[PDB]
Every structure is written in C-alpha cells, then in structure tokens.
Amino acid sequence: PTPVKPNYALKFTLAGHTKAVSSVKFSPNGEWLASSSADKLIKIWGAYDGKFEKTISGHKLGISDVAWSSDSNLLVSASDDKTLKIWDVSSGKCLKTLKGHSNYVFCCNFNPQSNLIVSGSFDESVRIWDVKTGKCLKTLPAHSDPVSAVHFNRDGSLIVSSSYDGLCRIWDTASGQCLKTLIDDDNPPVSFVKFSPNGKYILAATLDNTLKLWDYSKGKCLKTYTGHKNEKYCIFANFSVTGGKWIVSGSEDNLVYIWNLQTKEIVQKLQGHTDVVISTACHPTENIIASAALENDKTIKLWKSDC
Template sequence: MSEPSPTIGPAPAPADGAPVGSGAAASLPTVLRRQHDCQQGAVRAARLSADGAFCLTAGSDKTLKLWNPYRGTHLKTYLGHGHEVLDAAGACDNSRLLSCGADKAVIVWEVSSGRVLNKWRSHAAAVTCCRFSEDASLALSGSVDGSVRAFDCRSRRTEPIQTLDEATDSVTALQVTDHEIVSGSADGRVRRYDLRNGRLTTDTVGDSVTCVTLSRDGQCLLVGCMDATVKLLDRETGELLNEFSGHANRQYPLGSCLDAADAHVLSGSEEGAVHCWELVSGKLATKLTHPRAAVVHSLAFHPSRAALVTAAGGAFFLWDTGEEAEGEER
C-alpha cells in the first residue's frame, strides 16, 4: 500500500508561548503520552527533527521511518540500506534526511519523495553515527573503522572531502556546529576539531564514550560512558564540572541528553528507564520507568518544550508533562 508523502511544516509552538528556558520548558516530561510499535525490528535510534515536529526511527530491518510522534502517525518509510540502520538526522529545513548503517553506507534522502540524493560507501566498516553540518551542505559520519568523514552533499563526488582518523577505536558519537566537529570514541576520548583554526583538542574521559551532546548554550559537553556515568565537561577547558550516576550501563551504548532549558541531564538505562538528574546539584529528579523491560538506549528532547522521545526494543515512547494533551494531538 502506498504511503502518504509527509507534509513538512513548522513545529507546534511551545505551550502558552513559553520561551526556551522558561518554567514551562524547564519542567520535566513525566507522563507517558504514547507508545508505538514501529514494526521495523529493533529500533536502533530515535531522533527528533531540528524543530521537534517529527521523529525518525532507524530500524534493524534496514528501514528508516518518519513519524509525527504526537499523533503516532507513520508518514513515510525510506528503503535503500542493505543492513541495519544505526543512526539518522534531519536537515534544519526538514527537506532532507541523513542515515547510516551496518552496510557501511551514508545516505541523504529527499523527505517528500523518499528519493536517494546522495549515497557514499567510503567507510571500511559499519557507520555508527551521522550528522548534517548546520547548513546541510556536508554530511558527516563516524565509523567502527575509527574515522570521521565529511562528504559534500552538493556534488556527485563519491569520496570524502576530509577524513579525520585520530581515533584508535570506533567512533560512536558526533556533534557538529558552524565551526567545530565533536566526536566521541570507544577509546575513551572526546575530540574537538576546530575548523577555523585547524586545531584538535582531545579530552580523556576514561571508559568508552557512547554519546556526546552539546549544551544549548554551547558552553558544556555532556558525555555518556560505558562505566555507568554521564560526565559534564567544560567545552573549552575539558574540566569535569559534574558527574551523574545511578543508571545501569555496562553492556550497551546508551544515549543521554539535556532538557530544553539545560536544567536537567537525562540518560537511558539498561534497566528499562530514563534517569533524570538536576544539572547543578547532580541529584536524581525523577525516573521514567518504561512499560517494557527492554534497554532504553536512545532519547531525544524537544528543542523548546518539555517533550521527550525514547526508544526501547521495537518501539518509541513519547513523554510530556500531562498538561498539553489536546495541543500535542495535532
């Protein structure tokens, strides 16, 4: 059966017009609003679009799916990977998607048609993470082969325009700004590549890095590690500002993130929950227990309000404050 082409538009406005950092945005989503079986095997990653309006799920059945998570509506399926899809991201204007997988491929898709715009197979091993540059002119990918590669989305060139191969183990996480690439690796290091000055800064955090997140003010790095800790680092100096623990993480790579106001730290857990800590005090604020016992390994916070998407097993879950039920169902 054919699927409707997704209509891309602006994200729903924050409740009561609340700006980022307001009390509304700072509150934590503690109510499970929706859970949805994605029917794509195991969900390897769940990502929100840049405006928070749409959700991407990467599946072990080789598919990438686009959703309206607030309605639980499946909008489109993207077919073209030859193995499990491991990560995905959207362009800031919602016109294109980026995905990568165990087939060593990095693919750019046109959202509305599902057409493959670019496809690169330059990596020597599975590609674990991918991100667009801020203007979506570049696609960046990190791989088990230990490299970060940058591809030009505007040309038909099949080889990367730049390869960063300083990691001595798998690259597991990527973040990109207008002038910097931040990577996390299983060698226990976070590397910051300053593209303006051609400078590499390396911070050693100890255990394998599974997730790297920039704070919304750009001053801090949140680093998830396989020793069951999430570390908050000063972005410029690498100084350890705080450390969060209490969740279970010994076997699987888990996602972590900050809320829309940079007030709380959230992390998945192998015990089937999301742990939420206060950023400054480090105290556990709440724990979001999922109805299924599967590992909660991926999560994405809405950019401007208290809404959270998580992935566990073959499903994604939508959490909010319980105060906007009708407003979210749009």
C-alpha cells in the same frame, strides 16, 4: 520559573518496527519524529500524536543512527552496509549514497548550515561530506577504536567525537586538525558525546555507568550523573531546555533517566520499556521526550511534561 522537577507521562507508543530500534530524532521544525532500526528501515511519525507517516527503505543492512537537516527537508542515515544515505523526507527518496567508510557507519549529523555531514565508523575514522555533491571532503584518523559519536557545535566550526578508546576530541571543521583531546586516566570507553545547546560544554556518556558535563574550553569536568546503568550500549543523552533544565538518557535497566542539570540528582525515572532504552531525544519546542528500545521491545514511546 526554574522548576524543581518535571512530570513526564506516557502518551503514545509507536510499534511499527520489526527489529530493535537504534535511534530517534525530532525534526528541527518540531513536526516529526524519525527513527532508525536494525530492520534496515527508517520511519516518520507525528511528533505530537505519534501517528505513523511513512517508511523509508534502501539500506542493505541495519541502521545505527539518523539525523535531520536544519530545514527538516533532509535526513541522513548511518548503516552497517558501510554507507550513508541522504533522503528527501517528502518523497522518501535516496538523494545521495555516501561511500568511503571501510566498516559499519555508527553515527551521523548535519552541521547547522546543513551543507556538510559528519560521520563516525567502526573503521575508527571521522569523515566530512558535502551534502550537495555527496563527496567525501575530509577523512580524519580520529581514534584507535570505533567512533561512537559525532556532533557539530553552534556555528559548525567544531566537531566533537568519542570512541571506545576512551578518548574525546574536538576538531576544526575547516582544516580537519585536532584542536583538543580530553583524557581521563581511567579512560573508560566513551559511548556518546554532544555539544550543549549553548555550545560551551559537551555531555559525554562513558561505559562506567557515568555521564559527565565538560567545559572543553578549559578541560574541566563540571558535573557528574549516575544512578543509571550503562556498561555495554552506546546510549543517546540529551539536554532538555524547553521547560526546566535537565539531562535525559536511556538505560540498560529499561528506564529513561532524568537528572537536574545543576544538582545532578535524579528527578524522574520513566517506566514502561521492556528492554534497554538505547535512544532518547527531546522536542525542540515542547516538553516532549521520545524513547526507543531494543530487540525485546522494538517500540518508541512519547512522554509529555508540564515543566
């Protein structure tokens, strides 16, 4: 066990999209790969062979983010049209249109129970929705700048959000109250955040070309990850725990970066993308990485490793 470094190789390229891809997410059941784009479209691909499945349309503008329900039955999207849509993956049909945000919707996620949805927007608020009714349960004045990321913890009792205002906040799901604010004296814009698979920590990407692992419980910075380039775009970062433990993230030098979780040293740099890697995701069960890039690339790539 405890591999020293992985060996990710390019297996497939998924070209369908006609405009820059914004994000890619593996389904919880591991069967599918969903992708959002500026072309107003969502697309389903086979997670293993990259075979194109279907196109899901309905939004009136570009979509910045997409997320799966726990049973892999539903999808939620965040669009520039100020709304979110819940989709039935099987029929590609719009079940609910979540209206209430006053500006672009930047990010979105289900809770593990998948009865709620969290969303961030350029209107600087975090909103909590009821999946069944499509109602907006709570609106949080989360930040003083656009919200770049939103994520539930393991039991969905907490929400983590990040913003350009350089702040990062944990919220109590049930009350909407802010429980913790993570401050940095240099406070670079926080471009992304998410809880660790175990829920003890949060991984925060910040626009000073740095990724940081925080113990939000005791407000301690455990790890730093650099070497990559990120000064402009809100780029997804992941924990990879199917094989060896690593950190995965896109970059503005058109590369996919992989650090050793503990040593913080770069173990591999995936080459092939002809534009900024805006989104990366790791397969729930297998050693598989998915990556997407912007206007000059517009494609998704599937990488596989042994470690």
